[PDB]
């Protein structure tokens, strides 16, 4: 049907010296008109995943794990916190 | 021969061959013709 550009101009005419309304409206139209960072399946009788956010957290997790192992790698001491 | 512009600044001659005089024409047609030659002077 109608274009994403036409719907985007309609969404901007919809949303229209306050700041937080513009922060909210801009974040809303960005996460609405960005469809390639969700994943949608087809219901055989729909947003089923958030690929980039899941990827970002899965790689930041192992990034801090890798830096922790690189910090541990040639240590021999350690504080023993019994508190 | 062809229809050029008007020879004095009290009238205009359109390419058509019809002419209006500044004083004689109504202000609605003066707005319309100003807008028209503005577009014709914009393209």
């Amino acid at each position: 049907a109608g274009s994403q550009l036409k719907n985007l101009k309609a969404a901007l005419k919809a949303r229209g010296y306050d700041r937080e309304e513009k922060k909210k409206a801009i974040a809303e139209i960005r996460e609405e008109f960005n469809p390639f960072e969700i994943k949608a399946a087809r219901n055989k009788r729909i947003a089923v995943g958030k690929p980039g956010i899941s990827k970002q957290i899965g790689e930041e997790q192992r990034k801090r794990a890798f830096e922790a192992r690189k910090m541990m790698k040639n240590k021999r001491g350690g504080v023993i916190d019994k508190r | 021969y062809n229809v050029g512009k008007a020879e004095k600044d009290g009238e205009i001659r359109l390419k058509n061959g019809v002419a209006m005089s500044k004083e004689e024409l109504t202000r609605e047609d003066k707005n319309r013709l100003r807008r028209a030659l503005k577009r014709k002077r914009s393209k």
Binding site: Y17, D18, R19, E20 | -
Partner: protein
């Protein structure tokens, strides 16, 4: 959020409009800003303030200035008020129930006159855009729009249904035939503008820019083009300014007529027009010395038929007037002046002498106003209110009744404050003077002459009130104590520059002073220590405010933005741009970090100090908001402005071819219906006249567009385009081709629209029969055969008739050129 709203507005009695008078002297309807208030001249109490049912500041109030009322007008007998506003709308109210009956937007700019006509049911309206519209009240409809003036309607005069006559803000007076709504006769009245119009049936009177008042004779039953309205002579006035309202009366009990010309400044020139007996018995006296010269003298009439009268003056500049009369010794004239005040004068006249060297006002309603803009507003704990003016009109209004109960005379006073026990007012004036007043006793406790060398600009009490600070344009601030109830100057801090705002903290801690040199300085009161210098505002800087915790200050200026500063280190937080003219004042709430700022562009604005949003954008004033004051506890805020207003704020699709086909079918159906009607008429006129057909009523769309069917088909045939014309003619079948031939056969009898559409008729007809030639020559009907012959004869006659003069003009013009050549090549 617990938002704000407007509780009540007051302080205005007469605003930028006219006034209508109602009989019982009598009462008076006049304008406040955007709402109309009725007053009884006898006592002067505000008996009605007819206002819009929506409070300005509510949820559905729209984001602009409210429409200022600009013309009152009243229908007396059927009891209506037609009022008109500055956007162009006209609200008609019944004065019994005070609701809005009629809304009549219509115009595009502010409106300048109303008039009821034929006393009820018709209202004519002239506006600052040059249209003048007639409205019916039984149909709620703009009937007619008289549209030929060029600047702005300054007056008109109508009689019912046939003649209107208007005059506008160009030099032009125009007379309008209201049957055709075309302008009939136009003159240039005055060489600049034309501001006045009045007429008692024979003579018409107009005035323009400067003192030249022109008498005209309108002869309504004239027939010549120029001469329905002729000019009969000019005369002079005493005012060289714009006379801008003229109005007539016929006093009874002999019969006599009086008219006034109000002026721009301060003065109404009244005139008695005389009667025909003294016209006849005064003609000979200037016709003395006995005739070409005497005829020139008799032609050069105004001073003859018009007689000046008691020139009524006033204290202030005059905005509007209207009168009433009895006995010719009670010309009783109400007058609304610009500095808000109405005045009821009355001149007596013993029918030969006006019995006074100068007329006398019998009433004056001026108590609920100020005569100037309120340069400083203040409030009590919660009960009373303080308004400070330039004439001297300090006034102590009260919140719970909106009435000034106490008023004094100070001078050009720009700042004031209360005293912390109540019932006591400190004030500073624009010259080197300070003044003290109270509430129970009379005006002056004491004044201090030479309180400062130059203009004082801002003072502030301490929170206990015993010690106040005055900063003035003599580049000094001074401190004063209260000794026992008198003022004790003890110390004075001279700066390098003109201090123009002071403030202390609400806990006796800081003294923040705003200099003219684009900065503020924060001092310690206990040391004069020079704590901080806040800098970077980039124009001279107006009102400061310190928060309740004494941590956060605001800083307003003429840079159209307010800056938030943290007072611990003097570090800026925001620099938020409000208010596109100039923020005059800015004030916190009592207990919160929310604040208000009123500005020089007719708007107050509600902000928070944490997210720095704009909480609300309040839009009730009309002009420069000079001051605002917040309640000490609770937090309702008053704001006072340049439009003499003081207001409270509290909490809450076919195509070508088928278009031509349906046009052809209805057109030829009408055509042969009328032809059958004509055959019926000839048979019932050639036979026994006992019967005939009843009536073919003409077609709905044909009488709706006012066209004969040949013209209707002709313009839709015009309105198809040349690219799809050969398709529009190819789509239609042969029955529509036959009725197209009937259409062409009828249209070349009306030889007017045959000759104006010859190549179109030729192109369409020749393509039609060229495309349908195989079927046309197989039709067997002598009616169509005679039809084709008739079309052929008339069409070829028209074409040879136009090429005859074409060939004539070719040979004649080349003869002209050739005889010029053989003359002088």
């Amino acid at each position: 959020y617990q938002r704000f709203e407007q509780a009540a507005a007051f302080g205005v009695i007469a605003s930028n409009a006219n006034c209508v008078w109602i009989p019982a002297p009598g009462q008076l309807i006049t304008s406040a800003l955007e709402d109309v208030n009725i007053w009884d001249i006898k006592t002067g109490d505000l008996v009605s303030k007819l206002s819009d049912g929506l409070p300005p500041g509510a949820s559905d109030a729209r984001g602009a200035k409210p429409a200022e009322c600009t013309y009152l007008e009243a229908h007396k007998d059927t009891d209506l008020l037609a009022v008109g506003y500055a956007d162009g709308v006209i609200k008609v109210w019944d004065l019994m129930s005070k609701t809005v009956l009629l809304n009549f937007n219509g115009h595009k700019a502010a409106i300048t006159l109303l008039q009821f006509d034929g006393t009820g049911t018709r209202l004519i309206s002239g506006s600052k855009d040059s249209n003048i519209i007639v409205w019916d009240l039984v149909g709620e409809v703009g009937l007619y729009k008289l549209r030929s003036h060029k600047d702005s309607i300054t007056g008109f005069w109508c009689q019912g249904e046939d003649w209107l006559i208007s005059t506008s803000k160009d030099g032009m007076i125009k007379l309008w035939d209201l049957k055709t709504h075309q302008c009939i006769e136009t003159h240039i009245a005055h060489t600049g503008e034309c501001w006045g119009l009045a007429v008692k049936d024979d003579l018409l009177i107009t005035t323009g820019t400067d003192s030249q008042v022109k008498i005209w004779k309108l002869d309504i039953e004239n027939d010549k083009m120029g001469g329905k309205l002729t000019e009969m002579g000019i005369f002079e006035k005493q005012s060289k300014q714009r006379g801008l309202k003229i109005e007539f009366i016929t006093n009874s009990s002999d019969k006599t007529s009086f008219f006034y010309i109000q002026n721009a400044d301060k003065t109404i020139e009244t005139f008695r027009i005389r009667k025909e007996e003294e016209i006849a018995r005064g003609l000979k006296k200037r016709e003395k010395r006995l005739l070409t010269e005497e005829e020139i003298a008799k032609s050069i009439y105004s001073s003859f038929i018009l007689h000046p009268f008691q020139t009524i003056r006033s204290l202030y500049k005059i905005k509007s007037a209207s009168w009433t009369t009895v006995s010719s010794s009670k010309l009783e004239l109400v007058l609304t002046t610009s500095s808000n005040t109405i005045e009821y004068y009355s001149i007596p006249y013993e029918k030969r002498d006006p019995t006074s060297p100068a007329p006398l006002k019998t009433h004056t309603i001026e108590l609920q106003g100020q005569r100037t803009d309120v340069r400083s507003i203040d409030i009590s704990d919660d009960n009373k209110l303080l308004a400070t003016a330039s004439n001297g009109s300090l006034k102590i209004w009260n919140i719970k009744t909106h009435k000034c109960i106490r008023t004094f005379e100070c001078g050009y006073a720009l700042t004031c404050k209360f005293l912390p026990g109540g019932l006591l007012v400190i004030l500073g004036t624009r010259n080197g003077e300070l003044q003290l007043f109270d509430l129970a006793s009379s005006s002056l406790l004491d004044t201090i002459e030479d309180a400062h060398d130059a203009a004082i600009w801002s003072l502030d009490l301490t929170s206990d009130g015993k010690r106040l600070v005055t900063g003035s344009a003599d580049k000094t601030v001074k401190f004063w104590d209260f000794k026992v109830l008198k003022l004790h100057h003890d110390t004075t801090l001279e700066l390098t520059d003109d201090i123009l705002c002071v403030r202390v903290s609400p806990d006796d801690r800081y003294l923040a002073i705003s200099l003219l040199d684009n900065t503020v300085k924060v001092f310690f009161l206990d040391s004069m220590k020079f704590y901080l210098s806040l800098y970077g505002h980039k124009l001279p800087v107006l009102s400061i405010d310190i928060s309740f915790d004494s941590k956060m200050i605001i800083t307003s200026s003429a840079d159209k933005n307010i800056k938030i500063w943290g007072l611990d280190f003097g570090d800026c937080h925001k620099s938020l741009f409000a208010h596109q003219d100039s923020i005059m004042n800015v004030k916190f709430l009592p207990q919160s970090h929310n604040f208000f700022s009123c500005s020089k562009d007719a708007v107050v604005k509600y902000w928070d100090g944490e997210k720095f949003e704009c909480i609300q954008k309040l839009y009730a004033h009309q002009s420069e908001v000079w001051a605002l004051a917040v309640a000490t506890d609770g937090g309702f805020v008053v704001s006072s402005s340049h439009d003499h207003s003081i207001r409270i704020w509290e909490e809450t699709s076919l195509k070508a071819g088928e278009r031509l086909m349906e046009a052809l079918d209805l057109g030829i159906a009408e055509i042969e219906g009328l032809e059958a009607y004509n055959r019926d008429m000839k048979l019932w006129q050639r036979k026994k006249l006992g019967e005939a057909p009843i009536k073919p009523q003409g077609n709905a769309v044909l009488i709706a567009v006012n066209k004969t069917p040949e013209q209707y088909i002709m313009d839709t045939l015009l309105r198809i385009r040349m690219s799809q014309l050969e398709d529009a003619l190819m789509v239609m079948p042969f029955s529509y081709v036959l009725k197209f031939l009937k259409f062409i056969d009828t249209v070349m009898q009306n030889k007017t629209l045959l000759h104006s559409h010859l190549p179109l008729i030729c192109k369409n007809l020749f393509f039609i029969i060229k495309f349908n030639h195989k079927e046309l020559v197989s039709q067997k009907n002598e009616e169509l055969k005679l039809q084709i012959n008739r079309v052929k004869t008339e069409l070829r006659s028209a074409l040879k008739s136009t090429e005859d003069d074409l060939g004539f003009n070719v040979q004649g013009l080349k003869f002209v050129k050739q005889q010029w050549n053989l003359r002088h090549n």
